[PDB]
Design a protein around this ligand. Structure first.
Ligand SMILES: Cc1cccn2c(=O)c3cc(C(=O)NCc4cccnc4)c(N)[n+](C[C@H]4CCCO4)c3nc12
Ligand SMILES: Cc1cccn2c(=O)c3cc(C(=O)NCc4cccnc4)c(N)[n+](C[C@H]4CCCO4)c3nc12
Length: 364
């Protein structure tokens, strides 16, 4: 099995003990480490932080202690947007420029592969033509990686993609059957099913539906997303089940309705370290004082509330339940967003280093 873990190159700016650098990585924790994110300049792979070259060296240097470990570089992400992807896939010349630059870039810095994190072809302003052009891009990369292995005699560069769970995004952007053939693995973003964009509380990453849910709302859960990607032609061994080490938070309309589905007026208060309303790191929720934690029986995941703040998150138990699920489905492994949102240095939860991700490592 695979345990695929995302590193983020802006976690180095978190305050206090939440600051995360490559030295905070455990080289044995995961099987695959993915560096988020690279960017793009004139259709060519580029860095996004002043110290990326140094961090790349430290990141890929972890393989000196664990030669089984594989690293990948992720291009894209939310802030990157879509326009630069759209322009690069628009012509065969531009794709060739990108593909050649990716090979040189990954080999220069000692990455083992590329993870595609376009959010998303066919959506967020990307035109409908980008669905098939994404398929062509994946084919172009896969073909060029295969050819480069014959000329360098190194292990063939890996190609993965982070892919959405929501059927709207999947059908707008993803020829699942065609891209899954050319991807080494598929990192399913099985989270963000609910959040403070909604008018009622709901869980970030429930495993199953609640009974009150029917129709398209019965698809806003991990099981539905997994079934969709399997049905549409992803081999189970290539489907990697994403799990969140963060939760999504709400401000309740009234402290007098605290249920799942209770009215909410917007995002929860930003966390002291992550400072983004509507999400909290596991280490910001695990040690809430004076709160009430409960499990959503149907959905196999917890929520916690205190006063008018309500958070759906994942804990050790829900991670255990989801690994049991992925093994029953014969999936290829688990993926985690993100290393720096677990209690990576045991500073908050009194559970040791990486309590959530170490749970995955033990159960896989
Ligand atoms: C507004 C929004 C609308 C629709 C989709 N959206 C995202 O799909 C999304 C993703 C991310 C993200 O980081 N993906 C990284 C990642 C990479 C690989 C694996 N797993 C995770 C993101 N930061 N935002 C914006 C923050 C700020 C406010 C809400 O959420 C996102 N917003 C949106
Ligand atoms: C996955 C996801 C990840 C991170 C953030 N996300 C959103 O911030 C989001 C917002 C909305 C939304 O309605 N924003 C309007 C609105 C904005 C502000 C207040 N109130 C309302 C949304 N629909 N999705 C799911 C997509 C998926 C397909 C159909 O829509 C969203 N997903 C995500």
């Amino acid at each position: 099995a695979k345990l695929v873990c995302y590193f983020t190159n802006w976690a180095q700016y978190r305050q206090g003990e939440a600051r995360f650098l490559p030295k905070d990585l455990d080289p044995s924790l995961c099987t695959h480490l993915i560096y988020a994110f690279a960017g793009m300049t004139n259709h060519q792979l580029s860095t996004t932080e002043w110290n990326d070259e140094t961090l790349y060296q430290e990141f890929n240097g972890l393989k000196k202690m664990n030669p089984k470990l594989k690293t990948l570089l992720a291009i894209g992400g939310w802030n990157f947007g879509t326009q630069k992807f759209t322009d690069m896939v628009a012509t065969a010349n531009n794709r060739q420029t990108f593909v050649n630059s990716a090979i040189r870039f990954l080999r220069k810095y000692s990455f083992d592969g590329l993870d595609l994190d376009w959010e998303y072809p066919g959506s967020q302003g990307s035109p409908a033509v980008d669905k098939e052009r994404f398929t062509t891009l994946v084919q172009d990369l896969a073909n060029a990686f295969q050819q480069e292995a014959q000329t360098s005699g190194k292990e063939r560069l890996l190609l993965s993609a982070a892919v959405p769970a929501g059927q709207t995004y999947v059908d707008a952007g993803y020829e699942v059957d065609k891209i899954a053939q050319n991807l080494d693995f598929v990192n399913l973003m099985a989270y963000d099913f609910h959040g403070s964009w909604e008018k009622v509380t709901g869980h970030n990453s429930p495993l199953y539906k609640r009974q009150e849910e029917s129709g398209a709302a019965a698809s806003l859960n991990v099981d539905a997303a997994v079934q969709q990607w399997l049905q549409k032609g992803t081999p189970a061994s290539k489907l990697i089940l994403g799990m969140p080490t963060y939760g999504r938070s709400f401000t309740l309309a009234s402290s007098s309705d605290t249920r799942v589905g209770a009215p909410a007026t917007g995002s929860g208060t930003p966390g002291p370290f992550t400072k983004e309303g509507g999400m909290l790191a596991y280490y910001e929720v695990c040690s809430w004082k004076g709160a009430t934690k409960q499990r959503i029986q149907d959905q196999k995941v917890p929520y916690i509330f205190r006063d008018n703040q309500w958070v759906g998150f994942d804990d050790v138990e829900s991670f255990k339940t989801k690994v049991s699920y992925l093994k029953q489905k014969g999936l290829g492994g688990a993926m985690v967003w993100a290393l720096d949102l677990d209690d990576f240095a045991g500073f908050s939860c009194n559970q040791g280093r990486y309590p959530l991700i170490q749970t995955l490592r033990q159960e896989l």
